Amino acid sequence: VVGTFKAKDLIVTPATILKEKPDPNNLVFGTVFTDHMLTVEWSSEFGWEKPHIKPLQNLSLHPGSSALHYAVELFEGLKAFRGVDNKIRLFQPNLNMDRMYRSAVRATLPVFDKEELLECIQQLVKLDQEWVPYSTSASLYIRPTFIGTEPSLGVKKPTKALLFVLLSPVGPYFSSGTFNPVSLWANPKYVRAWKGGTGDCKMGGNYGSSLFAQCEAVDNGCQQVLWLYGEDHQITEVGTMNLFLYWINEDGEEELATPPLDGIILPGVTRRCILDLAHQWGEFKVSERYLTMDDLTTALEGNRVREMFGSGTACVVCPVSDILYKGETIHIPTMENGPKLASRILSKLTDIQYGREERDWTIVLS
């Protein structure tokens, strides 16, 4: 019936008692939640209900809900930043709405009007705007979440769903607020995602399967998993981050390389932004290309590697110092090379996020 919900229909139930804000320098990522959340119910029978902004509450779900049985679920991750000018900005949020819509279609969750969801998210951040931290090293994490709630054990396209948005204040990625280079666990026994799978979507099913390898990484003194793919051991992603390699390539050219979007790579907003910046600067070759462990070890032997880093909303730029592979520790000289490019990218993205320079990539809160 109701094709899609509208921000103009928002029903706002303000909280009576507002919670004390956390210290932005003693925050664990995604553990502290703001006063309010967005919820929107859908059914096949009646379509989208009116959207609600209401106090953070537990969800009341039928125990047969397909999100709990068949991972009929997806999420997004984007941030609000309090600028040096005290204006709150979103960063490329229409890219998150596009990616969420694409994920919903592949999940068989009901489609929604992307502009109306973004306006609902803006109104939620506006209401909880004092949760956007007063710190140029902290931000407000925005977690749109979309779950199948049909009370049927049939493996089927859902006839009931809930779209909701949580807000979580977060500090710097590492407590130190400076580059803490990560050690990676590279075990080809595990595969994050495969050709013909859903690795290019933020569907919950891609993450539950990763926890065992992450635990093995921590057991072996590593902070993140290096996700290897195929007989040639392609390096694909670092934990929940896109993978960048800054090196002299096989042709002796200075190059920033990242795996191509061939179906096993999550198309990161950060990844997109870094490729755009590197293209704009025009100071070295920019290549979306396959990179193997043998490519990397051959390059290290030839002193051709400068930097390796992950990219993502949570870290921005996460330098890599070491990879544990085939029972050996392989040193990556990222931190002995500045890291010049990683630092330059972090400085440029944070200058844009916190309004130190104007950009088409930011929207001031409505």
Ligand X SMILES: *Cc1c(COP(=O)(O)O)cnc(C)c1O
- For residue 285, how far is the Cα from the chain centroid? 26
* Among the listed residues 8, 20, 178, 211, the single contact to its own copies using CB under 8 A: 211
Q: Applying CB under 8 A, which part among 13-21, 89-97, 206-214, 323-331 lies near its own copies?
A: 206-214
> Tokens 């544990």, residue?
324
> Tokens 């290897």, residue?
228
Identify residues 171-190 at the interface with ligand UV5 (CB under 6 A): 173
Nearer to its own copies (CB atom), residue 193 or residue 308: 193
Cα–Cα dist 285/295, whole Å? 17
13: DSSP letter: -
Q: Mask of contacts with ligand UV5, 196-215, x by CB under 6 A?
A: ------------------x-
- Which residue, 99, 59, 107, is CA-closest to 78? 99
* Among the listed residues 4, 24, 70, 363, the single contact to its own copies using CB under 8 A: 70
Of ligand X, Mg ion, its own copies, none, which one sits near residue 270, judging by CB under 5 to 8 A according to partner kind? ligand X
Identify residues 148-167 at the interface with its own copies (CB under 8 A): 148, 151-157, 164, 166
Distances (CA, A) of 203 to 78, 97, 194, 223, 335: 16, 14, 14, 23, 34
Q: Applying CB under 8 A, which part among 86-94, 99-107, 326-334, 351-359 lies near its own copies?
A: 99-107
**In the complex, what is the shortest distance from the CB of residue 238 to Mg ion, in angstroms, rounded to a whole number?**
22
238: DSSP letter: E
Cα–Cα dist 28/33, whole Å? 11
**In the complex, what is the shortest distance from the CB of residue 85 to its own copies, in angstroms, rounded to a whole number?**
28
**In the complex, what is the shortest distance from the CB of residue 278 to ligand X, in angstroms, rounded to a whole number?**
15
* Among the listed residues 96, 145, 149, 224, the single contact to ligand UV5 using CB under 6 A: 224
Terminal Cα distance for the chain, rounded: 29
Helix 340-353 to helix 269-281 angle (10° resolution) is 110
Of ligand X, its own copies, ligand UV5, none, which one sits near residue 266, judging by CB under 5 to 8 A according to partner kind? ligand X
Asked whether the beta carbons of 97 and 62 are under 8 A apart, the reply is: no
Q: Which residues bind Mg ion (CB under 5 A)?
A: 113, 297
